[PDB]
Design a binder for these strands. Structure first.
Lengths: 207, 153, 126
RNA sequence: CGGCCAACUACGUGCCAGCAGCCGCGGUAAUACGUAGGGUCCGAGCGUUGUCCGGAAUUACUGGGCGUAAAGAGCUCGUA
RNA sequence: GGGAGACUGGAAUUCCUGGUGUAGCGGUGGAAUGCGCAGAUAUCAGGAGGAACACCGGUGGCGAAGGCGGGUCUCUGGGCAGUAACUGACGCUGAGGAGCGAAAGCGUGGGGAGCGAACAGGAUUAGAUACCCUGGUAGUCCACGCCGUAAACGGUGGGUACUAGGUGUGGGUUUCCUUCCUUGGGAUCCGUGCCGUAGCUAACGCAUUAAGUACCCCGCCUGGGGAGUACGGCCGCAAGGCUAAAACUCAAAGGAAUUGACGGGGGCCCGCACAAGCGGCGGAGCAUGUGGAUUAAUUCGAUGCAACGCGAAGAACCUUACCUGGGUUUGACAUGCACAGGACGCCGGCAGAGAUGUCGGUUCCCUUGUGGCCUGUGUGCAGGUGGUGCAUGGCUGUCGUCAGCUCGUGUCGUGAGAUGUUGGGUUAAGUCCCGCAACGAGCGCAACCCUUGUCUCAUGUUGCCAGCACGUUAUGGUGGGGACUCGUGAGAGACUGCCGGGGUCAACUCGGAGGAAGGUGGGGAUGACGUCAAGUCAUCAUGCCCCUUAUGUCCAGGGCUUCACACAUGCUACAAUGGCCGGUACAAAGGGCUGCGAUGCCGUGAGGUGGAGCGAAUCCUUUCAAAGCCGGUCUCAGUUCGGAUCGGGGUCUGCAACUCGACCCCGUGAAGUCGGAGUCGCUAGUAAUCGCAGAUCAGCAACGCUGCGGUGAAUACGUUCCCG
């Protein structure tokens, strides 16, 4: 076990909790319903890159905000997708649940979306070097990105031996606290097993 | 001690006798951090010694220390792939430390039914030149002398 | 020499053979052996060419001696372990015959790490 | 029909049965074994074995070498 | 110092003789054989004998090579320079052949001091046919002959001509500085070294003394073993030498160089690594884990550091994955395709160990198309703590919080690769400085974060109470008060900032001042590229394989707690620095709703009844401790120590304490007298010792783990040795 999770390193400094609420007696069931919501939303939506899911709770009314790169996919033009999600979130006993569907400004600067894309490309047929290089170039082309590292491990290329490969461009200071490192991880489903993809992205400091 | 010598602890003078040596003595007889018990033991022993002799206890304690303080000690030295017992001169602080440790231990296996009594008898016989700690100093000096052939390295 | 063998699973006769082979090394040790343990383990995967792995540990008067080998069966692993342990014990000897060649000795010769430094006068030779 | 060397997938088997000119392939997911689809090269032929030359500058005339890789006689005198 | 012969000198070793002279000498890492006390070793004088020739004496001379230095004499070989007088190509190489040829060895005859194969003892060792010690025969020496081999090597056949230089040194001729003393310097011939061009080479290297450029002649090689061996032959007194195969077998054997790893190689550094100390483990009893054995089963995983109070932050049932037995199969649990329905569902009765089975009571809402529920029939399917951590992801340990790991461009090399990253200094640090065919960069280091130590502003409740009032003992208890703590927000404060001295005037370093704190203040969090196919298919996920009337699933009971042993981590002791009894003082942190639970009362005590107040800076955990202090008693004993084991009697939780809980009371009173070889932790608020709390949790096997405070040492000379 080498490196701790970058989000968990700067949780009280740079990054923010993805669930904002307060509970004293009902902490346990709040956590249970939160993880249920998370797994439901991860399962239901896979076409559009679901970058992040936020939950805010206040008595009866519950606020679930999710960030996607393709809002149109997740919303029914007549509300069909919206109706379906609202309905099965009522089924989740969330009482009154209202949803704020949002959009990421620059998909290529978001580590989770980058890992999602690289994993998808890896799954079907693409050689892993091509995927990592394309992702690195796309993210480096973005104005605010200062350093990106992509690493994927497993039976790469359908081989019998597992391998770890990583390419880096610029600065990725994992030991520096004030540097905000966006961390994203996603497992690629191949016919030969499971390939794990991680992405680190450095975008300056926050003070 | 690889990068150089370490600083010493400046332990303070005793309040009710005003000497450094008694504080060193209490810290030698100390066990498990029970400082009050050690101080009670040493004060009782000193007062017993004063009663038996009739004079100040600190002077007799110094006399006992000088009677038991060593000057030449033997250490195992490895020169040219061989080990010998080499007699070495002892710095003053190490001599006082050795004397105090010997006094405390040899008083610990006396037979006087109490630590205070054992300590008082040991210090008295050391002042008079009959204690077992005095005998220990005799043996260590004899050992240093018997190996004087190896003092040249 | 008393040896305890802690195998696992299926290895019939491995324990007796290993105990008898290891116990013969007691005389080879130049110092009394305080403890001796042997562990036999077989790899589950049939793809492994040498599935059996044997390890040993001897306390040679406080000096730890250990070896580990692989084999295709109990006998071969135990024999390779015995060879390896014998080599380690030979390298561990540390009695006089073992260190007579390393003694700096060599009066004014063969500068070694522990060779006696030359005594030097205060004044230059000239 | 792994590479040399044109031409690859599936099923069966599992250090077996077997293959193989060399390197080497068989350890329940084999483009190297067996069989089927497909393919390639030849074609009234196609392969195997035996033998000779070539590749081999590997007996070097063309056209090699001898300090450490094999290779300067232990050193001289002197006959053809 | 080229060779042969003859004669001869001195030092030293050995022995013999004679003085003086005593009790050891000799030998080694350490000793013992051995010598000596019958006079040794030591010292002095004399004598005999053999062998080798210190200083000169070297990378210096001579010889074809082997090789050759005490001195003198005799005989003798070659080389070099100059003059060039003489002959006039008379040269070179040389198969076979002949001669010479270290040391060892062989023969015959001498000699034999020292050394010394073999051989004897001594020692070391597990064993020593060895290394080391004491003796010691051939041999070593001479004469005359055999042998004919060597890492006989420059691992380089002989002859000749040509191809940059620089600098030592040996022999000889000569011009000019000129003292002409002087290696003055030059030129030239002949040797002998070093460095270096061009060129050559796979590279290392060679390089006018070629391994370069060429010509003449000779010897030899044709993959590695078998094998320089067999057979035959020749030579030899013999040992043996020379010439010299094949069968068979392998897919290599080799040379140079590169990067690592390693060394009982060197250098420089670090770390509780050692040393200096303190306390332990190993001996006893018990708790816990593991091995082994046992059993129906003792579920599985973890095996040096880095497994073994580990997964387990809680095995009576459950957990539970194992065993015995009893049931069940679209299943204990999902979702879809169909047929039939209004019931599913509960509630009581019985049977059963229970699962389960059976009986009696209750019965859908849409809305006409059917939806929610189940029934069975099904059918897809579920379901595996089944296998493979050597197919995987994720997560983790470890080297190691060590300072290291790399890249772009350039340059060098045929290439692997190298440089940067090395050198001097410096640091905790690839930290920095100065240099430098390198110039930069990245991950690491450091900093940014938390906590702790000082102060300022803000701040007063449930927290303080200094100054005022009411208090009744019972106290901030109460009205009030910001003053002092404290709580939690903002900030300042340590930056070598300053001074003095070392320092390349550079890094850095020493000391001082100021300050709460001085030199990354203390402690955390943070773990580079990688390694060990390290761990984990049993948190989870997952490729492939396997089971599917079962390896799935339900239930009761049992097991995971078995015990002749072995290992590991701990606790309690073996006592007076203590046991026991009475009084008495000081903490922090944390927890609490179907939880903490007070006063009171009832029990001797676990405890019972009861419920105040508390989602808590408020109430409860008592107002909070124990070691501590004071007083009494015990008087060195297997004890007033020690508490194991066992008998009896209880309490609580729980459906249920038999296997198999904790606690209380009475009695019982084991080993144990400070623990072998060996081994562990720790550098200061640390070790040692004392108590308190939390998680898991109905209860607890908790002496375990994670925290909190109380009291509080010794020692560090220093890197030779052990480890990394």
């Amino acid at each position: 076990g080498q490196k701790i999770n970058p989000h968990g390193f700067r949780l009280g400094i740079t990054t923010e909790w993805k669930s904002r609420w307060y509970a004293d007696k009902q902490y346990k069931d709040y956590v249970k319903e939160d993880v249920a919501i998370r797994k439901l939303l991860a399962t239901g939506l896979e076409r559009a890159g679901i970058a992040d899911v936020e939950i805010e709770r206040t008595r009866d009314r519950v606020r679930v905000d999710i960030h996607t790169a393709r809002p149109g996919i997740v919303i029914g033009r007549r509300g069909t997708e919206a109706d379906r999600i609202r309905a099965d979130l009522e089924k989740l006993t969330g009482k009154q649940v209202q949803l704020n569907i949002l959009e990421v400004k620059n998909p290529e600067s978001q580590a989770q979306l980058v890992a999602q894309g690289v994993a998808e490309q890896l799954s079907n047929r693409v050689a892993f070097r091509r995927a990592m290089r394309k992702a690195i170039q796309s993210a480096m082309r973005q104005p605010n990105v200062k350093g990106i590292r992509v690493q994927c491990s497993g039976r790469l290329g359908g081989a019998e031996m597992s391998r770890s490969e990583f390419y880096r461009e610029g600065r990725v200071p994992l030991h520096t606290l004030r540097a905000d490192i966006d961390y994203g991880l996603y497992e690629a489903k191949t016919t030969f097993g499971r390939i794990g993809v991680k992405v680190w992205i450095y975008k300056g400091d926050i003070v | 001690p690889r990068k150089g010598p370490a600083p010493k602890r400046p332990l303070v003078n005793d309040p009710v006798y005003g000497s450094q040596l008694v504080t060193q003595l209490v810290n030698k007889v100390l066990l498990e951090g029970k400082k009050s018990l050690a101080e009670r033991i040493v004060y009782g022993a000193l007062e017993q010694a004063r009663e038996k002799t009739g004079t100040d206890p600190v002077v007799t304690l110094k006399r006992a220390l000088d009677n038991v303080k060593p000057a030449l000690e033997v250490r195992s030295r490895r020169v040219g792939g061989a080990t010998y017992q080499v007699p070495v001169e002892v710095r003053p602080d190490r001599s006082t430390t050795l004397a105090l440790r010997w006094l405390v231990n040899f008083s610990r296996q006396r037979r006087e039914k109490t630590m205070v009594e054992r300590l008082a008898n040991e210090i008295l016989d050391a002042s008079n030149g009959l204690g077992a700690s005095v005998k220990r100093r005799e043996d260590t000096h004899k050992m240093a002398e018997a190996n004087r052939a190896f003092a040249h390295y | 020499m008393d040896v305890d063998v802690s195998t696992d699973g299926e290895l019939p006769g491995a324990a007796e053979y290993a105990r008898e082979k290891i116990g013969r090394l007691s005389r080879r040790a130049h110092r009394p052996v305080l403890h001796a343990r042997v562990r036999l383990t077989r790899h589950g995967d049939p793809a492994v060419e040498r599935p059996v792995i044997a390890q040993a540990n001897l306390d040679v008067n406080g000096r730890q001696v250990r070896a580990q080998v692989e084999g295709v069966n109990a006998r071969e692993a135990v024999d390779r372990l015995e060879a390896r342990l014998r080599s380690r014990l030979e390298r561990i000897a540390e009695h006089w015959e073992a260190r007579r060649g390393g003694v700096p000795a060599e009066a004014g010769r063969e500068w070694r790490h522990e060779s006696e430094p030359a005594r030097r006068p205060g004044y230059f030779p000239r």
